[PDB]
Design a protein around this ligand. Structure first.
Ligand SMILES: [Cu+2]
Ligand SMILES: [Cu+2]
Lengths: 464, 361
């Protein structure tokens, strides 16, 4: 397992890598990558490319469901890293340095289509770089000096790591940009981004906060009012805000550079550029959450003040009153802040569902029931922590002239425990620190036995 | 706008920072932070702490709805960074360096309850560190030397950036771990993590791939079948997989280091530890997904022109068999080659297929 990285001399991070690790200099990150954002080292698929490997359209994901989002291909879907012709360092970062057959790097054809899914027809199937792995393990991080062909604009490099001891290969497509000469818009500098950060509701609004020579200046501010359910989609209002920004402002434009070096809004992350000589240096995004919010609440009934440790694991029998459409999460912690139980529940408004929690450990002491209340969209609304205790079963009141018939209950003998011995007499366990000897007995080691052991004089005392 | 970071001499990143930027050495990240993960520099709220400002239970979010997820407080919700007593360097990374009044740092009381929402009663309101801002703009990245008080175990440091040109401050809680000097579990070393990477469905499964001296060895593998809708929740099968790993394997254990130091599975990110001398090197996680509109789909369509510029869009969450009507208007009706990209996802948002049709005007 491993991914194309740029922690050292690497020229560009892979697409899946940028789903988790911000870019080397621009601090950019790919958006909406699915599960692969947690494990970018896992873009693994059948080997044999290009003859028989991942089928067309599934190259970027290597047919792995975890990385299926990477298979989307448009001119502005992915962060593009700058690259130059000629020799470049391609860096791999491994979490499991498998025995390697070889590495191979393919670049798209000069006139490839970026709005078409990645296919064999899109690439120069003759790799521009091959590194014999030698069927040995590499270091946990390696780099390959590769002669990158001459290109222009948006290109994609496919880095294939052929694992030597499996039938699989790791595929990492890389979104690169061949700029070089002709600096694209030298009079415009990026100072912010419109990330599709969240979905918004009707009544909400998203607006910009431009930072210049005199702090924030609301003359350049743009506000977009979410007036439709479809405009609430993170990609939608990001495109609309960038569009409204370009209508109302002149010293700043929002959107991705297209093939003509013209800033055009996209349905994703829209960078914000600042005109040189305007004094602007940074733009940030803010939100007005003015949509009518229901009065969310959760009521937990049935939590006893004390729970007696019984035969089985202690059990919480609770019921929940849900005010508003909420999503609840409950967890049980003990005296030492250790998790013992959990219960998720996507309740509706007014729904009275039953909850039942089993403690993984039923030990005495202070316990806590943490209750996290979210809405149907997952926003944390409130947290409440209720207290309760677990107690050991109360010993019965003392009765008779002793407590056990030796050796019954040998494990519980403490300072003052009276026992009946085989000689018909009563012996009391001596106090500190001799009470530890009252527990040591076995049919083989019969010392400390009251009336029979050779050393019971130090452990027990005959009662009268 | 800015956040507590550790790009240079910073001793520990802030909680919101770890929602976006991996840890310095451990590569860890906080999970399920909401929209704040895109903009960790935006945890901004009213000033005046602790007399006024963010109310109790909203300190970590500064009452910003964008950062509402940070207000949850349990013993194992957040990634904790090791720290020591005495003088330590705390680093701020600014995206907009506002005129600054001061920076103030507060640390939780020694016997604070990490399962209670963060409140003023949780913190020592006498700040252990105050840095003058001088009502001037700071550099784009600064560090402050602060005398961190002696603590043990899980603590939280609140870093307050009070800017001078607004009535707002930036609040960054920092999850720290006073590990002392005795290394906990020297015969155990982390070699993988179980991230709550996705929700699973009934019939799916999740399993481990244990990399050792001779590649992957399936004798060490553990598999968890998702047999109920509740177990399909990411935090649910993560904890269950970590639990099942501990039942079946002796050379590797899964879970966090609790207050008792033992490896205990949590309902979040579970690191996987490897017994020193076992030969194991790394553990990865894999998934079996064994569970005109054909099927319940969610579609996304976009129009591109000759020069790869977006001109129209149309989302539609169709059902099975539903034949709905679509209407797209081009923002530019110019001659040349055009493309219509059609992205096919499922009701859960997983990309299934993309088709690009060609046409001319
Ligand atoms: Cu691997
Ligand atoms: Cu700011």
């Amino acid at each position: 397992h491993g991914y194309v990285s740029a922690y050292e001399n690497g020229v560009a991070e892979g697409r899946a890598t940028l789903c988790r690790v911000p870019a080397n200099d621009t601090n950019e990150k790919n958006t909406n990558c699915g599960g692969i954002e947690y494990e970018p080292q896992s873009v693994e698929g059948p080997d044999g490319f290009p003859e028989t490997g991942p089928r067309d359209g599934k190259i970027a994901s290597a047919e792995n469901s975890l990385a299926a989002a990477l298979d989307e291909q448009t001119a502005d879907r992915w962060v593009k890293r700058p690259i130059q012709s000629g020799n470049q360092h391609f860096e791999w970062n491994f979490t499991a340095n498998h025995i390697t057959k070889d590495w191979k790097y393919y670049i798209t054809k000069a006139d490839w289509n970026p709005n078409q899914p990645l296919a064999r027809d899109s690439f120069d199937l003759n790799p521009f770089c091959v590194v014999d792995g030698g069927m040995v393990k590499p270091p946990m991080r390696v780099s390959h000096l590769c002669n990158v062909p001459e290109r222009e604009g948006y290109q994609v490099i496919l880095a294939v790591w052929d694992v030597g001891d499996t039938a699989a290969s790791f595929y990492n497509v890389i979104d690169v940009k061949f700029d070089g000469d002709s600096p694209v818009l030298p009079d415009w500098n990026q100072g912010g981004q419109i990330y599709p950060s969240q979905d918004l509701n009707v009544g909400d609004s998203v607006y910009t906060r431009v930072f210049g020579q005199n702090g924030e200046n609301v003359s350049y501010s743009t506000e977009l009012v979410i007036d439709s359910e479809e405009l609430g989609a993170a990609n939608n209002w990001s495109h609309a805000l960038a569009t409204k920004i370009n209508q109302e402002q002149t010293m700043l434009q929002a959107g991705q550079l297209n093939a003509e070096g013209v800033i055009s809004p996209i349905y994703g992350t829209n960078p914000i550029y600042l005109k040189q000589g305007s004094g602007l240096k940074n733009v940030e995004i803010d939100y007005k959450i003015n949509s009518t919010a229901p009065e969310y609440d959760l009521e937990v009934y049935g939590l006893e003040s004390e729970y007696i440790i019984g035969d089985s694991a202690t059990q919480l029998d609770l019921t929940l009153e849900a005010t508003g459409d909420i999503k609840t999460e409950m967890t049980v912690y003990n005296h030492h802040h250790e998790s013992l139980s959990s219960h998720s529940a996507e309740l509706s408004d007014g729904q009275v569902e039953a909850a039942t929690m089993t403690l993984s450990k039923s030990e005495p002491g202070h316990h806590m029931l943490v209750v996290v209340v979210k809405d149907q969209q997952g926003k944390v609304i409130e947290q409440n922590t209720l207290d309760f205790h677990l107690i050991e079963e109360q010993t019965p009141p003392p009765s008779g002239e002793y407590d056990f018939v030796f050796p019954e209950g040998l494990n519980t003998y403490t300072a003052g425990t009276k026992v009946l011995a085989s000689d018909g007499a009563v012996y009391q366990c001596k106090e500190f620190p001799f009470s530890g000897y009252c527990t040591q007995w076995s049919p083989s080691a019969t010392q400390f036995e009251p009336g029979k052991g050779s050393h019971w004089s130090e452990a027990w005392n005959k009662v009268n």
